Write a protein that binds this ligand. Structure first.
Ligand SMILES: N[C@H](Cc1ccc(O)cc1)C(=O)O
Ligand SMILES: N[C@H](Cc1ccc(O)cc1)C(=O)O
Ligand SMILES: N[C@H](Cc1ccc(O)cc1)C(=O)O
Ligand SMILES: N[C@H](Cc1ccc(O)cc1)C(=O)O
Ligand SMILES: [Mn+2]
Ligand SMILES: [Mn+2]
Ligand SMILES: [Mn+2]
Ligand SMILES: [Mn+2]
Lengths: 462, 456, 462, 456
């Protein structure tokens, strides 16, 4: 009588274990200390991991190999990386309309960035697994154990909901696989048709308060599309697009259980994390001798590491030597998150020192996480202008060094939320209370996220 | 050992609500017996989940099925008799997708036209039973969406939680099917290399070597003409199951957007579904439900079928005369198909409608071995397809497709084939949770044999 | 000892004649009076016609059927027609560099017009047969029989060269077939690669005195091309383009001898003029009951008729009823040539009356032939501004009526000649003496012709 | 009855002028004997005409021939023995293009790799003669570029005007070949329908029916896989002839632009040319001329060829080791090819160069019938190709192509084939101006036979 349904779990499948040699390596890596982990019983975690070891994967190795090839092109300055989605996915909002809205928002941004960059845009959603977060404080403002994301505990402000529940590992997988199934369906459908997506962009221009500002570029894009059609271009590639899946690799119980061995028809068999295509390590879990970095070493997926204002050029180089030991362009993405007031100063010496190693990382801008403040109305928020300005500074840093501004990583949604201040809608502190729906950080709403794409497209054209 | 889901706390057009309600108020056979309050809670959860399929895919399938109905493509439908939660694994799903693709390339070459590939996967978790009590005195197993296979009373109790578990398993499997078909798994060259290995290491491989080599030379010719890899890297595999548990199917209904004609109810648990022999009551809820949804649908037709009732199905389920909207799945027994099928085909053809005529050569050819196993002889399966082709050839109508039960596993479930599986062999790997499936070699051998029927 | 080589002629092939019924129709049509015909002996003309009846055709029926399909799209407002080349081709200048230059100039114009129009451009060269012209006066300023074009007599100002020589019919065919062979080779080569052609346009923008003016659009075109490549567009259609062949059908001895019966695998067999893909009838030979119009009725090719300032709406309708009797969109092109000072007034009532017939002609602008004057330095010339202004007025006429401004027909060359006044080079009366090379009317040089395309592209965008 | 052309009234790089001059100062066999002043005037005209081919096409052909040399494509070269001005007509040109395309589809399927199509057209107007005086006591006919076929003295005088007439005819023919190959003439489906008609109405059609049906099923399979019309509508047919008359070839030289490496002399009278058995003197002008031009070139090799001299041709004509730059055309007689060819192939292969090994099964198998006609037996032609394949099969080398004399006409020139053309039949339609050609049926029958050699 709690209005919840229990779904029984079975670990019946008989599947061979991972090879002894790879397990031996994995065990040695996971013996390292791991920050920010859930505190549930080991016996229960083991049982859940055992279930997840036998489930169909979310992604397959050939997709990850294909992504790696596309990311190598980004690292070489021949493509641009767009990564975006919810700050925190919730099980409650993991619905068709919400997923479709986020996929749509990403695609809308991508066509604008493609035109502005004059090169392919690799589209990576924060989706199908972004269910876990780190917490700075053990006790939140309400005197409760902190919400850690839906893979660990519940958002609701009650004690029972905040207890760490290892059954969530399986609920997370169910939600991730369901979302990924839909993302695949949507991208191979008309939704990712280039003409349809740009029609939405055209509507945005009509009805945005600053639409006059973006009308020139929008018209130019439309004339570019029309030109393709006029040139008799095969329409086949226009109809569908590839959207990859990503999340912060935080809960090692989940990530380790989703490891699979590739079939070895591409090269040599090895460990892939098939919970996603690519994952990144967060600022609070990137300890150089910690388990997260060690885990990222062992897997074959492309990986990223968040770099905040305390980053040194020397530590950045250590990440490069640990995580890109074979010098594979695009294998490693370094995600700069410095604050708009600091990026121009702190980023250049890191870029210089890393470039001198001879490795080719992707330099990606996260203009969100270094630009967060609390409004006077109590809401955790970010100003659009500061977000835009960090990307601007990021481009200036790279332009001065002759290096590639390789992409952005943003928190966005297709919803008309009121979470970030500013944009052409001029969202105010007062407005924030209307639709502040994020379970964690403030997201750019659908209009703000498209406006950012127009602005970044202009930076690319400069 | 429970994961737990929260029960969530825009209305249909009035006419669709009225029609759905009317369909569901009709009597429904073979339904689980679980409490209505619990079923409702499970349905409420399922009404909020991401769909297994989307309407544009179903519209696309309908277009491809119209081509089949017009005699311009061929329908291959196949997979497990019963999917189980236990066996819903990567190797098993990959094996079945592979088996289907292997058959498809052979049938494509033999038919000289496209083959529409529809898998009995991502939802085939419910079955009817003639008897509530089985041979062991237990309440019958009705598939994993309803109760458990294990032969004990507690496991056989009907459990509405399985509705959600079924969705979880379906969506996981569908995700993988999509991934596998966009991969190199569905590259033509790769798939036909597997067929070449089969020819080397089959006891009757000499028999199929000529056609296998001809296919290989056909593929090479494509490459030689400079037309390779344009469309060969990928394929579309659609999802199907018997629409049996109305609690599940109704909860997976979604209303389409106004982009295509008018808004319509689609069953997004699958691309296409069929109504079985025990649930096709003409005034029953299953047929009424099939009338309300926009998916392509099929109806199983067994040996008691009359030409007149077949026409009544056509007029109820294809009221607007949409080629391929309706598939009539003949399942008559190899000894009866030649006698019973022609007067049904004639009467239906005279209506001016264009159904897909599909052969189910499995369900009319089942017997029990002396070793206790429920089995089917390969020869009888082949012979029903043969007779089905003869019927259509004599009438000038289109033998439109097959519907088979198969797996990529090396099971020992059906007698015969080039491996010459015997009654004794059956005990080695009889793994089906319901009917005997053609194993990977038998299913490929059938494709070679059907390809020769197509060439004749 | 005249520095000429005689090439012997043989009429040896044994080929079946045209069907008796079609010949009966053709004879009845050619019994009509024909203006502007050469005055060579009938016996000699017959012998030359007999030779030409057996030679390989310049074009084939399937190409003409394909052109007709593309012209139907123009007539329906879904494509734009670009027709251009020398005023008069000469045998002496029928060389690889000159042909390549003209093909290049046309392609350069086409990519700009394609982008501006946002729809396909049908490319029809005045080439591989434009060897005959009408003369108003029997005696020219030098007291000689007038030059009639190289199919009839020689440009050189001497009596012997000006005598009408029926062997020219065969020399014309030799030159036409040679030129057509090269046009085919050039268009299926890298020359008609879209990227290569637009690079030339980019160079033009750098070095034109008014390049600043066209830089915006040129950059936009470049970004449009880059976008195609970024979208992963199949490059196959970009590599090659179709350039069709056209000329004024003037010398009926030539045109009748180049008639062939199609093989009848498309529809019914009928008469095609295989000296070209499409031909037009000139202002001085378009007598409604004359042989040229009657000849155009009998052939299946798409045809055009020049319409000058004396045209009435009623006569225009008669052309439509004679030449498009089966109401086939694009079969008939009406080519308006009214003078820039008259087009806005004279064109509308013609368009209205023709549109009311229910037929769909292509409305094409010839902004050259109504805008010709004689400079004070003696040269026959045209001002660029007047040429541009007639096209401008032509667009205004159609915009007001809701009808389709369907194309242009211009005289151009890839040479850096000094024939038309004005353009960004500001060609003056004095400049004309430097490189006035036309054997008849003044052509837009390569820079002027590309500048016109930019200007017309802007008209299309308005 | 003369058309008259005006004699027209940027220099080569110094090294190319020096090398061209040196090549042309060497002795040249089999040249016409006409006055130098008149030849010069004709050359001056030809130096100003539009070229028959362009350098980018020749570069593209070189790339495709490299693939042949590497064992990844097959070369089909064919057409009239001697083109005539009289027969340079639309029906005749279309017929020959059609015959070549028909052969090509069959060879493509049999080889399981692309076929490079090179026609002996648009320039094959000159031939050598062993004797200046022929059997009638007249100065020999040397082809229409030199003198006339008619058996009278005045017509046999060497006339430099024919140089221009040859160009006029070549450029006209090339224009049509281009038009025809971009049309539906070169649609695969259309061309193979003609092959199906041939099978119906050949006296030995039963023999080729299996392969013809297999090809048809291969084409249908392409269409079924959704890959039809992407590349099937058109094909590339290149132009070739024996480079014999140096006045013509030198006048048709053009210097390429700097876009590709460095500027080079291309002979733009054709895409590729070969040097004949009577003009391949190792220190002669023809070989020297072939060294200076950038086109792919070939050399005919008859039964007096040594392995050592073959190597000397390879080292002179392929000095930079460019696969496919050089084609060695074996022409040994069917009774000799097995004996003479292997030691040549071995010695050449040991050099590390990759030539194309091409079989000319015509010119070593010619005899005079008792009815006076110069003829060849079909069986001997087939047997030389057979032996050529056996030679390469034993050595592990690539049987790279054939070079045949054919026409789309139903002539009676070669004995045998399924029509069983006899000595008596030869008088009906013996139309060749030089050697006996395979007629349209014989040429297609050869393709079927060679396709089976390729499949073995
Ligand atoms: N074999 C599945 C495991 C599974 C699949 C999908 C899922 O969302 C959860 C769990 C079961 O036993 O139920
Ligand atoms: N909204 C999802 C519902 C869900 C998704 C996936 C699934 O397999 C079952 C149930 C949740 O709360 O968990
Ligand atoms: N058969 C050609 C006719 C011909 C072809 C080409 C040409 O340019 C002129 C004349 C001849 O007798 O010469
Ligand atoms: N410039 C050409 C030369 C020419 C072209 C074509 C041809 O067949 C022969 C000669 C002329 O004066 O006629
Ligand atoms: Mn965040
Ligand atoms: Mn079954
Ligand atoms: Mn003019
Ligand atoms: Mn010969």
């Amino acid at each position: 009588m709690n209005w919840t349904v229990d779904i029984p779990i079975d670990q019946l499948p008989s599947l061979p274990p991972l090879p002894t040699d790879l397990r031996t390596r994995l065990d040695a890596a996971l013996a390292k200390p791991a920050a920010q982990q859930p505190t549930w019983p080991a016996d229960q975690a083991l049982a859940m991991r055992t279930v997840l070891e036998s489930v169909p994967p979310v992604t397959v190795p050939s997709e990850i190999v294909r992504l790696q090839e596309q990311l190598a092109q980004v690292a070489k300055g021949e493509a641009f990386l767009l990564q975006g989605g919810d700050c925190a996915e919730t099980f409650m909002d993991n619905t068709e309309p919400h997923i479709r809205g986020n996929v749509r928002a990403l695609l809308q941004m991508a066509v604008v960035l493609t035109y502005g960059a004059s090169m392919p845009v690799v589209k990576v959603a924060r989706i199908a697994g972004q269910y876990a977060k780190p917490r700075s404080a053990d006790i939140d403002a309400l005197g409760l154990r902190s919400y850690r994301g839906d893979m660990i505990n519940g958002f609701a402000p009650d004690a029972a909901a905040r207890e760490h529940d290892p059954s969530r590992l399986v609920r997370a997988y169910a939600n991730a696989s369901a979302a990924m199934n839909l993302v695949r369906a949507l991208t191979s459908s008309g939704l990712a048709s280039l003409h349809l997506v740009h029609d939405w962009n055209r509507e945005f221009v009509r009805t945005s308060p600053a639409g006059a500002r973006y009308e020139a570029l929008a018209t130019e894009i439309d004339r570019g599309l029309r030109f393709m059609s006029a040139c008799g271009v095969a329409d086949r590639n226009l109809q569908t697009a590839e959207i990859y899946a990503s999340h912060e690799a935080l809960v090692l119980d989940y990530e380790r259980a989703m490891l699979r061995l590739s079939d070895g028809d591409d090269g040599e068999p090895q460990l892939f994390d098939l919970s996603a295509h690519t994952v990144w390590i967060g600022e609070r879990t990137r300890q150089i001798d910690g388990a997260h970095i060690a885990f990222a070493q062992v897997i074959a997926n492309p990986v990223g590491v968040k770099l905040g204002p305390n980053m040194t050029p020397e530590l950045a180089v250590e990440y490069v030597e640990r995580l890109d030991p074979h010098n594979k362009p695009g294998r490693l993405t370094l995600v700069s998150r410095m604050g708009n007031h600091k990026v121009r100063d702190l980023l250049p010496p890191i870029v210089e020192k890393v470039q001198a190693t001879g490795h080719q990382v992707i330099w990606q801008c996260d203009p969100m996480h270094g630009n967060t403040h609390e409004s006077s109305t109590g809401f955790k928020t970010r100003h659009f202008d500061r977000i835009v300005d960090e990307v601007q500074g990021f481009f200036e840093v790279h332009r001065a060094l002759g290096t590639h501004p390789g992409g952005i990583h943003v928190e966005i949604t297709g919803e008309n939320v009121t979470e970030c201040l500013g944009g052409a809608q001029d969202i105010s502190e007062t407005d924030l209370a209307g639709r502040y729906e994020t379970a964690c950080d403030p997201r750019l709403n659908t209009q703000q996220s498209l406006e950012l794409a127009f602005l970044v497209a202009e930076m690319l054209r400069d």
